[PDB]
Amino acid sequence: PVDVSVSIFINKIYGVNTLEQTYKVDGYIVAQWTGKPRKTPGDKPLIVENTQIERWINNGLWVPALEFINVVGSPDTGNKRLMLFPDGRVIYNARFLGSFSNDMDFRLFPFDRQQFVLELEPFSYNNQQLRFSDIQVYTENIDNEEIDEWWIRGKASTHISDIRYDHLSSVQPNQNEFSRITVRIDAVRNPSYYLWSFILPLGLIIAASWSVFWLESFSERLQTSFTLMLTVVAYAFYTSNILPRLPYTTVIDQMIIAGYGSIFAAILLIIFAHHRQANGVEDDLLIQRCRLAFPLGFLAIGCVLVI
Amino acid sequence: PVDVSVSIFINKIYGVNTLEQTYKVDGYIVAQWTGKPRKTPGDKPLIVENTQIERWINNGLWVPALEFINVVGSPDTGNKRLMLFPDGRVIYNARFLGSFSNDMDFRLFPFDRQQFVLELEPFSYNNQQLRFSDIQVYTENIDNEEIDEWWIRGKASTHISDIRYDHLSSVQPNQNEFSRITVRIDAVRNPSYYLWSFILPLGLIIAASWSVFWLESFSERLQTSFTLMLTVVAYAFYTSNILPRLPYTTVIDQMIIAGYGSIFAAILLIIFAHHRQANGVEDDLLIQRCRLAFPLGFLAIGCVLVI
Amino acid sequence: PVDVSVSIFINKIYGVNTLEQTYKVDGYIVAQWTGKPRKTPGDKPLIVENTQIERWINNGLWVPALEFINVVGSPDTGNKRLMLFPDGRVIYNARFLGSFSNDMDFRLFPFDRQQFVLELEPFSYNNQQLRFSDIQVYTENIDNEEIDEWWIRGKASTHISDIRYDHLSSVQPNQNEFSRITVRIDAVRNPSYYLWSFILPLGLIIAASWSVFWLESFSERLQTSFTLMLTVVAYAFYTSNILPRLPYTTVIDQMIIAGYGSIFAAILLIIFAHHRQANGVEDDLLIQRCRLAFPLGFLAIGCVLVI
Amino acid sequence: PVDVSVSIFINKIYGVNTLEQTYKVDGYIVAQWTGKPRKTPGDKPLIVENTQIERWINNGLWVPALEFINVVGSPDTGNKRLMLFPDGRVIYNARFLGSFSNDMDFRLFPFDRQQFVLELEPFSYNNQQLRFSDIQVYTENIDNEEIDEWWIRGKASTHISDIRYDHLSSVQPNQNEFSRITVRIDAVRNPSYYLWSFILPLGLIIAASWSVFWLESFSERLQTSFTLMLTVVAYAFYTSNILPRLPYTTVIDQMIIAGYGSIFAAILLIIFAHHRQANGVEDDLLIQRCRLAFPLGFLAIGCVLVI
Amino acid sequence: PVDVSVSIFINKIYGVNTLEQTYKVDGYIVAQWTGKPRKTPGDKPLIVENTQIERWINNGLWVPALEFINVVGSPDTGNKRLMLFPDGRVIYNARFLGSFSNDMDFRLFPFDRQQFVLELEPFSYNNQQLRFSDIQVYTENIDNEEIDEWWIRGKASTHISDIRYDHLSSVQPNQNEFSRITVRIDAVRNPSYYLWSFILPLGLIIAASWSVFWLESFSERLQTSFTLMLTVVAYAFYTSNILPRLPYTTVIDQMIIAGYGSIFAAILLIIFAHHRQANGVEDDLLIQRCRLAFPLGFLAIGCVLVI
Numbered sequence A, B, C, D, E: 001p002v003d004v005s006v007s008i009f010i011n012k013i014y015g016v017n018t019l020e021q022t023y024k025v026d027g028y029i030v031a032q033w034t035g036k037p038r039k040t041p042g043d044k045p046l047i048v049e050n051t052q053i054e055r056w057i058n059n060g061l062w063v064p065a066l067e068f069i070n071v072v073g074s075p076d077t078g079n080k081r082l083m084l085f086p087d088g089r090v091i092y093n094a095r096f097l098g099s100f101s102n103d104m105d106f107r108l109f110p111f112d113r114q115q116f117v118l119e120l121e122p123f124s125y126n127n128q129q130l131r132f133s134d135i136q137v138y139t140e141n142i143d144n145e146e147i148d149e150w151w152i153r154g155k156a157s158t159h160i161s162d163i164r165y166d167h168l169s170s171v172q173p174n175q176n177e178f179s180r181i182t183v184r185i186d187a188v189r190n191p192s193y194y195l196w197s198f199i200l201p202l203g204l205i206i207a208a209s210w211s212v213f214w215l216e217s218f219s220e221r222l223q224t225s226f227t228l229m230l231t232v233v234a235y236a237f238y239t240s241n242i243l244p245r246l247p248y249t250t251v252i253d254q255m256i257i258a259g260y261g262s263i264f265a266a267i268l269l270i271i272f273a274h275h276r277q278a279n280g281v282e283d284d285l286l287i288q289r290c291r292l293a294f295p296l297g298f299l300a301i302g303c304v305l306v307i
């Protein structure tokens, strides 16, 4: 076979779509193999720019097609390079930009912990005709973490493994496995903005909903509860426009549902408290002293849902 | 004719547009037929990469154009392969990405049951010059269902049928039918997020609207009803921004309309209850005891609209 | 001249932009003319696939360029076909997708009645060098009307006419008219969702605004009117986000403006009713009995604005 | 030099981005110059379709590149024509679509008065090698003004002028000026929808804010003022979603800010009126009679801000 | 090596994405070097238009590839020029449009101070084979600052420096540094619209929240506080839709959080004031006199958070 050493450069990672489970990675790719010696002009290596590689391909020069497994569509390939040493080795350099898919679980959304995965595999040649010797990833673009959405933790890991296809055994007897390169890039979401702007006003609004039990008029308590329900609906629509469109509930959504249930339970308990009277002589005071038990129950519910 | 065996690979399915009735499917397509024997270099099969297929086409090699019937525009074709065995058989491999249309009914929106349909047909050659022998679809990319919007149920089905065009009989006497391949992929929408975040707060808000009959002041009942109407408008706009823009009402929209009607009926009944007095001496109490009949009537209306 | 018979296929129509007055039409186009006889290989007709038409064009084969007059930019041309009979006739087949402009009036928005117009004209050749014999449009893709936004009524009409350009008389003495094909496709908007979700809650909210006159406290009437005004603002923003961005008011916008005016008139009349007293002894009762005349006046205003 | 007569056709103008200061213009461009005589086949002029112009360019035919100065990126060039008379003159025809930038001031937004400017200049040849003789613009596509966003007033004006570059004097001694064509197209925004749907409900809401002084309870006046403030916030968010994202305030924004200030001043004056009492015996009546001076002051403020 | 003089023209700068940290720059690039003398037709320099440069490249003419380091994908290259003097010097001119990344800190969002950075470096040739002599940037397009989002302050600065790559030492012994050109363009955000439409109504709403302490009824104070909380939620959602989606809080977000905390503290203090009574005989008056200390405390908090 032919040994190919791959170097992958990463510039900057963006375009995370939560519903589509795609993210955009921009950077360079460097591929280097060894071929037959050629007589280049001069002792210096010969270099071929963009839109001149096709002339050498039509001449008969052998270059492989290293596609990305998890990319959708085609990557936006920029400038391409093809530098030919006279002693035999060929270095291929190109710049790409594409949307890459992954599993990308989003439970515990403000405190996410997910990895960006890049997969590389030759589109044409199998293990017996093309191998990957080693890959050194270059995630050198590391800057201050305070103004970035994603916190890159540690250094990216690389692995080389063989992938066997079951459907290639129909026409190919013993050569049906392909060399694949997988690169994992760990990242942690920045939780400062979400914690400061979403979690804390939920706590303040939920405490405001707890505040309704300190009143003395039943009808005015009902109107206060309906105003609190409208406030919770308004904050729910405020969160849902800014939060992404992932197909399952987060901690914020569970907090919103728990607040809805708390308002409904408050309405039911004050209605039951006003109409516990035998003949209208009893006061709604004995069961109305849940002002120091209802927030403790909600805190217990919160501690249950976190764990 | 020429027999062609087609293999269709599916990577991941996304981009469902409810108004446009389109969805995006990414994957590979493999086409294999048999031709005249050729003298390739060596006993190994000859393989042709991307942007070199056109040279063989200009040379005189016969390849067909297998278009997708239901795609809009043109698919984003990635890397293409053309591998030539010396004993005669030709294998064509390509990767595509495009938006495919379907019927895609969206009634009962949180509990959808719809199929993704891929259609394949040669753009040029009819039944007497090109046939499809068989197709084996490979929907092997199956993962955990908990973090996906669509639940792939079962295995995708394939069918080969002939489609006859009426307009081709003007110039073609007896050869006017085309071999078509149709692939059905069943899917079920994930209902957990919608049921937890939309259906339940509608029930809580509708119960809060039922709660207005437990008051004792007519004017305060009117103000409570207007506050409840504003709350229902707020939740309606909260749902309509997050719910898709399908051109007909769902179960959630019917629930919202029923809540609007319930508030209007509550307003009309309390107005009629206050002004049923002959000379202002009667109390609004006899007809106001619909507090345990109005929710039962709404539940009956709901049971009617579900069935 | 050369006679050309055009067949236009329509797949599905979507992408209606109300502000841009554009819509997207996908389908096929078939052009057929007659040329000099040629010696094709065998008695069977010779067929040319995609990206091989240019070789025959460079050889000297005459094909025209049939552009769309009302399209913006360039259509997304898919696979193209070029089939050469040996007795002389040439059949050209292609698939397109583009955004087509029209007048597209949107007054009476929920009950629209507008036509989709496709225009075809040769980009290069005039009447003396190219003619259109006839066109048969194929709008065969007709399905159930219940789940579609647009109701296709009847069958599409076709017309062939000559268009004369005034600016071509500077260099061309007597040949300045071009053969043009115009295809009209009638369509009616689906009014069920709009009528169920927008018109009816406007009626309910306007009746709720009528309900304010049944109170007995002037200050509480003012607060009720301000709450109703906030509700109408909320529903106005609910409609304006979902309704399109056409540059003029619809029936829904006129209803919203009339509701605003009704609330303002209610506020002015109750203010005048409270302060019609000579020395504070009169009751606001005689002029406050417009509870059964104000809705009739609003219904008269509605009947005026519909007609 | 070589004289070139340019004809510019305009189809329809759309895509106005207020923040980006770009607009989309679709139409044709016709360029005509005179060259050496050639022997075309027959006495009829020879015509070259799309994707065959490059063959004549490679042969040695001289065509210039007429770029647009104010376009961003590249225009979406459709079909191109190249018609060669045998007596010498060459006519070049092409269709374009691109986004053109301008100054495009947006102060007095509902009553805008701005011009669309198209600039043309050869990309390669200066005044001594290429000149523009004259341009006749064809804005013939004029229709009814009632259903269009922009009112085209008058006929478009054209001007031919020379533009001198300072940086070209380093290598070019006396030939550093370029012939430029500038076309001005005047347009007026349609004010009917904005005046009916935004300005009038602002007046109604501001009158509703004026209505708070007619009450008799200080606390109820405060609650009414807070409800009016919430209504003004709701209408502000209703306007800001539909109004464009221009980086400075319009008349509507100034009206909204003035309404905010009016509510704040009303709150401050009623607070001062309640607490002007020496020992709680005075009534808030003498300074509370600004009910017929505060709207006059707001009208004076409005008349100041308009002028 | 070969000396290359670069001239960069800037047309207009737009498309600032706060989350993606990208901005769009349109303009020209001019590259000039010196090569071997050639015999052009005539004493005039020979000029090569678009889509004819590739013929000279295939002939053997040496042109470099000057890529942008910080661009994502590929720039939208418009018309390209290649003008060949007969005495030896080559001038290359091209027009580009692309999205360029930067650090682009957004703290103190209404009063931003950030620089637009353009980086240029040859994609292929190192310092020993290609050098940049000097660059003169032309930011001549300066207009009135009143109608622009970004205020260009001063003149753009240019710098030429060498960038050494560590990974190129594996195959290249002593030639591993690349000549890079960096251009800084300073800009200041326009603060007039933000200050007039966001900061001032926050102050008015916060003063309205301060106004709640002037009441005399505890329950009515609670309802006023809940209405103020709903108003603050409404204004928060009004700001968050118009403000960008940067991943950290701005001054406006800190003001909103401080207003939430002020409302919660007001609720807690009035609840504590009503229930400081030993047996219900005390009045909530002594601690309720924080009406002239709570705004001073909030102003102190604001002065702390600004500094």
Ligand code: NA
Pocket (backbone or CB within 6 Å): none
């Ligand atoms: Na009240």
Ligand code: NA
Pocket (backbone or CB within 6 Å): A234, B234, C234, D234, E234
């Ligand atoms: Na709202």
Ligand code: NA
Pocket (backbone or CB within 6 Å): none
């Ligand atoms: Na929105």
Ligand code: NA
Pocket (backbone or CB within 6 Å): none
């Ligand atoms: Na909204």
Ligand code: NA
Pocket (backbone or CB within 6 Å): A227, C227, D227, E227
């Ligand atoms: Na309220």
Ligand code: NA
Pocket (backbone or CB within 6 Å): A230, B230, C230, D230, E230
């Ligand atoms: Na509200």
